[PDB]
Amino acid sequence: MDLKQQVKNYTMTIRNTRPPTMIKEQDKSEFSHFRALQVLANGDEVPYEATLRNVIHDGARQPKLPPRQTQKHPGYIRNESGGFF
Amino acid sequence: FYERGDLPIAVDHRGSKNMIAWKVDIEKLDYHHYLPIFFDGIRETQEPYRFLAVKGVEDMLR
Amino acid sequence: AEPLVLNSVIGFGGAIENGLIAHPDGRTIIYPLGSTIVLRDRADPRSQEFLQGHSDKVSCLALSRSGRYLASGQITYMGFTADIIIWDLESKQLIHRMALHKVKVQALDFSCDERFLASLGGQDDNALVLWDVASGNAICGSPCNTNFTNCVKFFNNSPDKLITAGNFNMNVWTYDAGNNKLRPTDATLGTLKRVFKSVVVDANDEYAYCGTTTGDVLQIALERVLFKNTGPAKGNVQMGVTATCEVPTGDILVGGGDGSLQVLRTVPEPSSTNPKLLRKMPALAGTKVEGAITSIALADMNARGFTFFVGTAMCNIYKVTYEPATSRLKEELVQTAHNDKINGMAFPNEYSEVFATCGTGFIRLWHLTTCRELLRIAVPNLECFCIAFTTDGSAILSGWSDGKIRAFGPQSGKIIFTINDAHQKAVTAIASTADSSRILSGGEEGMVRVWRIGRTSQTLEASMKDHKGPVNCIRIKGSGDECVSASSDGSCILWDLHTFKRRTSLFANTFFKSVVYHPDESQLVTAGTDRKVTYWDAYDGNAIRIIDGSDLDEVNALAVDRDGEALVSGGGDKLVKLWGYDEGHCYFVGVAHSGAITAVGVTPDKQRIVSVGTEGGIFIWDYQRP
Amino acid sequence: MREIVHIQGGQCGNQIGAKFWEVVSDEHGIDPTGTYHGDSDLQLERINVYFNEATGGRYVPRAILMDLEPGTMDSVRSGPYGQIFRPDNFVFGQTGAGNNWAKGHYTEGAELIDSVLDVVRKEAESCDCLQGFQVCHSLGGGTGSGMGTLLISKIREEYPDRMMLTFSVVPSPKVSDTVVEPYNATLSVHQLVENADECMVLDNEALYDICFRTLKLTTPTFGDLNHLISAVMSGITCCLRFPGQLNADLRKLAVNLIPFPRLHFFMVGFTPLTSRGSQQYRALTVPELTQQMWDAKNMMCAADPRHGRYLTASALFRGRMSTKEVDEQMLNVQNKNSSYFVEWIPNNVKSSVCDIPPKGLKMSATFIGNSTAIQEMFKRVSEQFTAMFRRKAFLHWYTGEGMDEMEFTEAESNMNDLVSEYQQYQ
Amino acid sequence: MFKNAFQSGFLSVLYSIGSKPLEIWDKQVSNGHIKRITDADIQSSVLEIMGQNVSTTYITCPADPNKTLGIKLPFLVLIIKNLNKYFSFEVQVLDDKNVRRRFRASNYQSTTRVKPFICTMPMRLDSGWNQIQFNLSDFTRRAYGTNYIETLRVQVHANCRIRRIYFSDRLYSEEELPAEFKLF
Amino acid sequence: MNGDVAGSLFTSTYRNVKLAGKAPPAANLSGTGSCFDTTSLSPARAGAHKALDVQKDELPVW
Amino acid sequence: REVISIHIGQAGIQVGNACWELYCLEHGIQPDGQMPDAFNTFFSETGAGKHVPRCIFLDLEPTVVDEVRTGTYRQLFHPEQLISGKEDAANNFARGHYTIGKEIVDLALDRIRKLADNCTGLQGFLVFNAVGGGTGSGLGSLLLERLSVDYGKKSKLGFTVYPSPQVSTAVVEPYNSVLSTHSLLEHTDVAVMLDNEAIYDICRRSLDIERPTYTNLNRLIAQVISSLTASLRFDGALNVDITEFQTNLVPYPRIHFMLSSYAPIISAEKAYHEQLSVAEITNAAFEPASMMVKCDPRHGKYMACCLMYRGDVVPKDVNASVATIKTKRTIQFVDWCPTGFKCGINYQPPTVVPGGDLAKVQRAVCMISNSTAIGEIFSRLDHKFDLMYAKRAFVHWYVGEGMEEGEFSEAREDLAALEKDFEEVGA
Numbered sequence A: 001m002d003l004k005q006q007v008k009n010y011t012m013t014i015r016n017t018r019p020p021t022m023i024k025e026q027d028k029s030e031f032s033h034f035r036a037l038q039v040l041a042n043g044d045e046v047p048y049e050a051t052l053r054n055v056i057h058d059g060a061r062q063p064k065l066p067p068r069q070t071q072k073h074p075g076y077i078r079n080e081s082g083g084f085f
Numbered sequence B: 001f002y003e004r005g006d007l008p009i010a011v012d013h014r015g016s017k018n019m020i021a022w023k024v025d026i027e028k029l030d031y032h033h034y035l036p037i038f039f040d041g042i043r044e045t046q047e048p049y050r051f052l053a054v055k056g057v058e059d060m061l062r
Numbered sequence C: 001a002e003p004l005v006l007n008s009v010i011g012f013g014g015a016i017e018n019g020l021i022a023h024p025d026g027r028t029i030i031y032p033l034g035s036t037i038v039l040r041d042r043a044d045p046r047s048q049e050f051l052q053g054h055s056d057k058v059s060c061l062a063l064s065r066s067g068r069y070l071a072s073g074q075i076t077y078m079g080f081t082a083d084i085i086i087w088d089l090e091s092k093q094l095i096h097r098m099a100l101h102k103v104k105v106q107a108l109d110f111s112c113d114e115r116f117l118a119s120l121g122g123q124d125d126n127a128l129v130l131w132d133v134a135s136g137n138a139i140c141g142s143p144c145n146t147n148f149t150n151c152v153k154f155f156n157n158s159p160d161k162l163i164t165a166g167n168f169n170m171n172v173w174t175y176d177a178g179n180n181k182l183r184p185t186d187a188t189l190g191t192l193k194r195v196f197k198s199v200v201v202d203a204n205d206e207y208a209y210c211g212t213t214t215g216d217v218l219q220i221a222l223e224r225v226l227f228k229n230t231g232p233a234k235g236n237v238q239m240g241v242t243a244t245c246e247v248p249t250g251d252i253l254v255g256g257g258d259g260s261l262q263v264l265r266t267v268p269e270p271s272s273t274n275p276k277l278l279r280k281m282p283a284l285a286g287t288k289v290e291g292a293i294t295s296i297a298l299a300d301m302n303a304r305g306f307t308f309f310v311g312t313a314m315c316n317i318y319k320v321t322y323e324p325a326t327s328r329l330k331e332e333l334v335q336t337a338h339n340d341k342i343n344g345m346a347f348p349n350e351y352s353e354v355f356a357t358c359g360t361g362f363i364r365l366w367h368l369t370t371c372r373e374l375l376r377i378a379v380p381n382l383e384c385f386c387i388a389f390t391t392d393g394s395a396i397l398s399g400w401s402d403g404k405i406r407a408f409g410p411q412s413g414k415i416i417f418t419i420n421d422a423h424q425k426a427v428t429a430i431a432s433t434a435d436s437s438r439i440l441s442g443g444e445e446g447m448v449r450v451w452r453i454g455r456t457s458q459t460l461e462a463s464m465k466d467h468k469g470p471v472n473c474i475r476i477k478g479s480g481d482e483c484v485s486a487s488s489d490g491s492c493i494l495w496d497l498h499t500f501k502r503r504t505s506l507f508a509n510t511f512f513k514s515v516v517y518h519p520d521e522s523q524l525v526t527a528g529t530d531r532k533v534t535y536w537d538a539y540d541g542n543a544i545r546i547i548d549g550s551d552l553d554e555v556n557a558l559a560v561d562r563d564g565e566a567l568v569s570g571g572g573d574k575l576v577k578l579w580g581y582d583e584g585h586c587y588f589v590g591v592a593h594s595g596a597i598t599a600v601g602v603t604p605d606k607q608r609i610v611s612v613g614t615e616g617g618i619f620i621w622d623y624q625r626p
Numbered sequence D: 001m002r003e004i005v006h007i008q009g010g011q012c013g014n015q016i017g018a019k020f021w022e023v024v025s026d027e028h029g030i031d032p033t034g035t036y037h038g039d040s041d042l043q044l045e046r047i048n049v050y051f052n053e054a055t056g057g058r059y060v061p062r063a064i065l066m067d068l069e070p071g072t073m074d075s076v077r078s079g080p081y082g083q084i085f086r087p088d089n090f091v092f093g094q095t096g097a098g099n100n101w102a103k104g105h106y107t108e109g110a111e112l113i114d115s116v117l118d119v120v121r122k123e124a125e126s127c128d129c130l131q132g133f134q135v136c137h138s139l140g141g142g143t144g145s146g147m148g149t150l151l152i153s154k155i156r157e158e159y160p161d162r163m164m165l166t167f168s169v170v171p172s173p174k175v176s177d178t179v180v181e182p183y184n185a186t187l188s189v190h191q192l193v194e195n196a197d198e199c200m201v202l203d204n205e206a207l208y209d210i211c212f213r214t215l216k217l218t219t220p221t222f223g224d225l226n227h228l229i230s231a232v233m234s235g236i237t238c239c240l241r242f243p244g245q246l247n248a249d250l251r252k253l254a255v256n257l258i259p260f261p262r263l264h265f266f267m268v269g270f271t272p273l274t275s276r277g278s279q280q281y282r283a284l285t286v287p288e289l290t291q292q293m294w295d296a297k298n299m300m301c302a303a304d305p306r307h308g309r310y311l312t313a314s315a316l317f318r319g320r321m322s323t324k325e326v327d328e329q330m331l332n333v334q335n336k337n338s339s340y341f342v343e344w345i346p347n348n349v350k351s352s353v354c355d356i357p358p359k360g361l362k363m364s365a366t367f368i369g370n371s372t373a374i375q376e377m378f379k380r381v382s383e384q385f386t387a388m389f390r391r392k393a394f395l396h397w398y399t400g401e402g403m404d405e406m407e408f409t410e411a412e413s414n415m416n417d418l419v420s421e422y423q424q425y426q
Numbered sequence E: 001m002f003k004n005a006f007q008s009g010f011l012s013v014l015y016s017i018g019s020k021p022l023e024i025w026d027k028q029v030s031n032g033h034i035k036r037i038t039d040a041d042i043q044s045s046v047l048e049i050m051g052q053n054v055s056t057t058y059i060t061c062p063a064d065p066n067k068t069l070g071i072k073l074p075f076l077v078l079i080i081k082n083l084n085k086y087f088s089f090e091v092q093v094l095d096d097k098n099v100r101r102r103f104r105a106s107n108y109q110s111t112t113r114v115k116p117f118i119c120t121m122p123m124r125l126d127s128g129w130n131q132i133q134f135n136l137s138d139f140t141r142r143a144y145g146t147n148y149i150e151t152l153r154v155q156v157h158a159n160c161r162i163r164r165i166y167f168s169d170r171l172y173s174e175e176e177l178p179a180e181f182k183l184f
Numbered sequence F: 001m002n003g004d005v006a007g008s009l010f011t012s013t014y015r016n017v018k019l020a021g022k023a024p025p026a027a028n029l030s031g032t033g034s035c036f037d038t039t040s041l042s043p044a045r046a047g048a049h050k051a052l053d054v055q056k057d058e059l060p061v062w
Numbered sequence G: 001r002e003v004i005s006i007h008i009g010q011a012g013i014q015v016g017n018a019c020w021e022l023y024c025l026e027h028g029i030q031p032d033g034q035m036p037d038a039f040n041t042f043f044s045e046t047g048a049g050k051h052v053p054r055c056i057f058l059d060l061e062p063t064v065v066d067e068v069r070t071g072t073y074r075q076l077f078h079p080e081q082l083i084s085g086k087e088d089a090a091n092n093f094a095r096g097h098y099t100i101g102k103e104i105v106d107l108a109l110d111r112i113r114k115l116a117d118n119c120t121g122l123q124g125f126l127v128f129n130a131v132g133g134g135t136g137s138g139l140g141s142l143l144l145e146r147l148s149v150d151y152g153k154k155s156k157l158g159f160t161v162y163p164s165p166q167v168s169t170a171v172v173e174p175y176n177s178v179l180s181t182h183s184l185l186e187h188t189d190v191a192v193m194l195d196n197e198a199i200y201d202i203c204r205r206s207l208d209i210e211r212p213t214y215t216n217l218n219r220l221i222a223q224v225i226s227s228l229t230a231s232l233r234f235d236g237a238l239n240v241d242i243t244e245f246q247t248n249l250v251p252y253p254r255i256h257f258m259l260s261s262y263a264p265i266i267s268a269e270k271a272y273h274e275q276l277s278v279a280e281i282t283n284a285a286f287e288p289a290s291m292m293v294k295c296d297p298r299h300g301k302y303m304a305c306c307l308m309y310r311g312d313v314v315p316k317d318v319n320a321s322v323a324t325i326k327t328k329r330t331i332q333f334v335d336w337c338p339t340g341f342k343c344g345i346n347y348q349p350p351t352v353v354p355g356g357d358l359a360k361v362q363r364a365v366c367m368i369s370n371s372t373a374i375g376e377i378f379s380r381l382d383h384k385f386d387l388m389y390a391k392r393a394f395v396h397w398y399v400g401e402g403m404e405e406g407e408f409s410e411a412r413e414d415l416a417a418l419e420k421d422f423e424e425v426g427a
């Protein structure tokens, strides 16, 4: 409707046409990290830095909660006739 | 031009072959500006467009 | 009964303030694991003997200047006094145990002449108690403030000490043996209302440096306790200053709350030709660290540079060399581990030196032989549960708390597929079948689902809801027909692939936790919170024999050898049982995982046993005959 | 998209606002220096409501500080989360009014309000689609009540189509700090009923009472009282800043709670409030929240709601909850205590759910009740005012500055017809 | 961009009252400055572009130079303040022959030239605030036999105080104009 | 265009020294002495730009 | 045969968030918008390997809308379908119908214009709105007015959510509901009521979830919509179209308010429990414990009834079932309609949604009927409407927007006239 939303829509149409990307962010690279593994298996003197490679995905938007309890102990509450839901 | 949306055209979607709801009246329209547009649209084969083009040409000529 | 030799150990607690501490002499680092402190040889990664004795998590550490005596305190259940334990580092023995602080002991500190200890404790207690080290006695105590206080430190002459609030105050306490009392004088902050985190006393007691939560270092002149110019002139640090150490020169190395290190020049200077001093200009903006800094310790004395060991809330020990000649910090992380509790681990079929350990927000691919972690992929804020490889090495399946099953590739960690709704809530068990076309899932709802993974789509086949409790484990057979599901109902169900149906149901008084097939599908071994291991006949279902092993608390981990002669068992206690299969016999090891062990396995080539406990630790054992 | 402009007046307003921006910054995960350091991405999408983005990825608050003495400004920049305010927002006098409503509305206003208006107007045009103005101030002080009240009048003269919240503490005789409390409160009330859209009346006696009984704290410093008021203000705008299953805008709250343009004085509550010693023996369920919510000892006013009727009420929940539990609980409290609601308005309880709880808890709520027991408070002040104004006590520091006696007589008339119309609807 | 938008009777491309007025515009400041100040005659925030050389400092409408906004509205309306300095503004338009002409209205020239790609026009202003209406379609029909199709980009130069530049479809009068587009 | 220029003196100086927190340039106080007594008037000229650069030996050679 | 579905308000968009999840689940469409002829009534396939729905979500707050924009179905919807204003109507009918409607409605209908133009065999419209809110009632009525002046002839299936008698989450919803009904009368052709108390009881009683959120409500409402549109989507033994409800259920041009129901609402364990046949589910679809609107039809008399069936259903037993029911006297019909039933059968069974609680049932029934119980509901709303208007409460918000008391009085007497018509027809 407004100029703000219009430019948002333009960007999002472009972003939807593109094929989905598996990684949100990429640390180092698969090839550079792979070589470190090779020199580790071949011998020694490899810093911990090179072998450890990390990847970050989208994951949930929400913040983190302890899990919600849907049901309490069945002894407290029953449906109209009875039973434990 | 239809994408831009400056054409006063819509589909009735009747039980018979649908007709064109003309927003403005057809008689007072400028033919110098529209007839070439509709006649150029006859080449279309996509379902939403060719029907409008042919029916508009028909109606204007009548 | 004979103890099992303990090979390598990976894991340490970084959440504890000022936890990572080094030995004054030679080669020794020491950090707190779940509820036992762990010594390590600084030179070679060979685990040193642990110091047990704590009822619950250790929450503070302190070392004498000489390095003879060590003190630690724990956090306990609400309403039970926490005790400080003093160890001797020549004879590793609990010498003194003293319990005065109600809930938790906030921090400890030794005197320079090692004649006294200081303990401040309790987010609610807020009482400072002075102890003498000669005997487990307390000299005098005083309620500190209205708002709570974080850290204390002794001077370098040691008649006096200084303490600072969490919230809004700071005092210097002098001790006189005339009244046997503590006299406080509070600092004179002009208008500042800062929230202090850490303090360090100088090498000659002229000033002190306290890191506020606003993100600046505050230099407090001692004796009159008057505040002096603030910290970094080039803006504050991105979070609360949480770590502080003093360089042996006239310098201070401060670690901000977001993985930032800075060297700060402490000598004052007036600029703009004024009586006013300018702010402490940072001599060196050290390179960044991924984790929130919590612990800094000065490791070594070298004329060409100074090395520091830096802990992080992400549990990444870094070594950093500071070269004062050319101002630069170089950082190399030497160990990493899990920050939170871990649950579930995985083994690739007939492959040895790979681990899949997944805690909160993280999947980690470990290399067994050296323990050097290889690959870690993180979903931002989610809880991981049962992790499992596929029988073919491609997919690594992982359940999550939001109810989504995700599969990743072992190389490059690229997510291959996801089920935007596997269950209504967290899924707790996931298992791949030998042909890697089917996948079994179980959430807390108690429903077992089967998914056929197509080459581009994944679809759900019939889903059974026998259980009323959360499914705790799921184990498939060699052939695709049979899978058993163990839930907290007190029942274990056997299912049928060819017809999504049940044959029979094993029943126990207590909820079944872990369940394992005997090799060659002769029998089932089930372990639960009935404290009782149970054998079952695989075919018709019957209680063969009930072993009362580990009757004191619940047993939740069963692993079986590849032939089936031995059987590894975890427990609610801290010991790992190693049974013979045909006979109820023990070869167990006691002293490990200060927190309850949650999963255990044995490598396919039968050389090692691997255990993971409720604290972030993975303990590689040596496998032997039963 | 919807924008709240915060205005703080007087010493109380400035210290409350200091805690308010502290809690808000903690919810949206920005550090006390002004950089985002949260983890979830729910917090990025809704900081445009509260923090104009600044170069350096620094989010500075959209607040206008307003007082007359450098003492309070020092105390604002002093404490933590003080370096995040924009220094030019400190619209600011030099001497101080000090418990003189005439000095806050005729002497110093005439030369300070052009400046504060220019910053407010300039801050309003800094955001695109205004939602409303939100002022926190007192009714007893001079620099807070008088200055803020003339500001309210000028703003409602400028932007008549935007909502208006006033978090105003009111005097109580038991906690009576200054002496001309009725002289300041009456004239402020007479102006707030004609300019403010709705007013969330607070009081310090009820807060101290709450910290004595329910919290069971020993020494309730002002840091704690302002912390509770801060939690209330964060509860009232959780809905614009976070998605939920039943979103309740501020204007949505106004139309549900204001049946008549003058019946807009609320009483506020907040739950859960339990000591540490009892934090472990309690559960986190909607009935546990609701029993505490409708309790008369959890209102933040010195007015017993059982001494009157509820015209309308509203409740804003936060946390992963079950709407069936929410509605049936409001159904039970409406059917059990049927005599305490008014009869000619069915369904007197508007409720809402948000999907994000405040930090440190599992679940929370917030009660806002337009009752007719608030006329007890206004009677309690107007009777003091009459006691003085029969004598003309303290009157000359007012009439000697430009104000006339007609202001006081008209204020008495307007307070009297207001409490008479509350009593009529009871 | 702007090709999938609605493009009703009014379309605003830049407005001086917002969280980010220059969200699509790419500023090019050299020997100059850009501000958002409050003018003393309308009591509102205006965007100010002022530089020594008029040719250096400007703000183009679509940020990425290859990306071009497409707008089919005939009339372009600018609300500017005449500061007795040199000021110009330029627009690209598409004809039916799929060629791109440029129309530059300048404050400091007298002649009116017609060139294959550029039509330079003189522009005279009053003293205070003023809204100008351009009538893109008619100017195209006059400078060339062709007619108007699309407006590809717009760019304004230095020494001007601008606010609410917007397109339209009709030569709207004041009483029929809405409020937020009106002057006072 | 300020209606009253001195209306900003106090607040603006106070703001720079305290609100913004910027270092206040505090010079040219030599010889002012105390209040209640006359400041000894220095012969220096305020306007004059007595830089008079002397790079005696720092001058490079052609 | 294609139908487009628009969603107006906070409720409408969330119901649609469940509906379109179920649709792509049925026709096997992954959420990114591609399959790994039956879909053609909902999803147009543009370009190559891409399916876009025939719907527009519109609202005035951006909150729930960009929740969809950033939720699971980002890639599915085309980003121009999701209209969002700037600020709410906020439970104010006049604010939603005159102030902000005048700017948003033209954009809305000139978006659905090119929707219908891309369509070829447009069957009709079907709208989703809650009349208790501000936008769903205010600009929903404005959009319905302008859609009727545009097309007029076409059927507009309205699945509206009404306020329950005692369970309520608003205060001015009597005002909003009456002013919406004043336009709901003469603009829509077929309007289906869906309350919230009735569905709460259903998921408490049969689905036995004790803590149900709106998610579960929207899920089984998506089941009802899919169950009454599957006739167009799939080929059955006896299929009936959307223009049939226009003909077989509306005996008078103004009496179009339909009580809905659905059976079998059965949990996962009760599936193995109960022997699912046709006679009992046709019985279960008639008891007031399984209807979506909280009212008791025993007080009323039926005018017409329509029964959609899905799954393995032969017409013999449905003939026997409706035979037994027409011979029963526990429910009574009106004298103006001897043949009060209309069956319809489709071959495909209803699908299950992973994350739902409904088990895979081989057959299902969806009843859409006409009665005078609705004539009781409108009196219940009108009674509590005049209670508030007796004191002129809340009127100043509307008048301050620009409206008056004239439309209040005329909407009041309109429901009075409708009540007279219901009591006259029931005789």
Ligand SMILES: Nc1nc2c(ncn2[C@@H]2O[C@H](COP(=O)(O)OP(=O)(O)OP(=O)(O)O)[C@@H](O)[C@H]2O)c(=O)[nH]1
Binding pocket: D245, D246, D247, D252, G008, G009, G010, G011, G012, G014, G015, G088, G089, G090, G091, G092, G130, G132, G133, G134, G135, G136, G137, G161, G163, G169, G170, G196, G214, G215, G217, G218
């Ligand atoms: N069935 C169902 N009803 C809902 C849902 N969410 C809200 N409602 C109903 O919506 C009614 C109020 O209108 P809302 O939809 O919340 O908001 P609105 O219609 O957009 O009107 P405004 O809030 O003014 O914008 C309440 O009576 C709720 O019962 C839902 O998820 N499912």
Ligand SMILES: Nc1nc2c(ncn2[C@@H]2O[C@H](COP(=O)(O)OP(=O)(O)O)[C@@H](O)[C@H]2O)c(=O)[nH]1
Binding pocket: D009, D010, D011, D012, D013, D015, D016, D098, D099, D138, D140, D141, D142, D143, D144, D145, D175, D176, D177, D178, D204, D222, D225, D226
């Ligand atoms: N809750 C709270 N109340 C305060 C605070 N400071 C002052 N007050 C109350 O404000 C009332 C008088 O307000 P006052 O200080 O005169 O406002 P001002 O002088 O105009 O800024 C007294 O009754 C105080 O109890 C505070 O920090 N918190």
Ligand SMILES: [Mg+2]
Binding pocket: G009, G010, G088, G090, G133, G134, G135
């Ligand atoms: Mg709404």
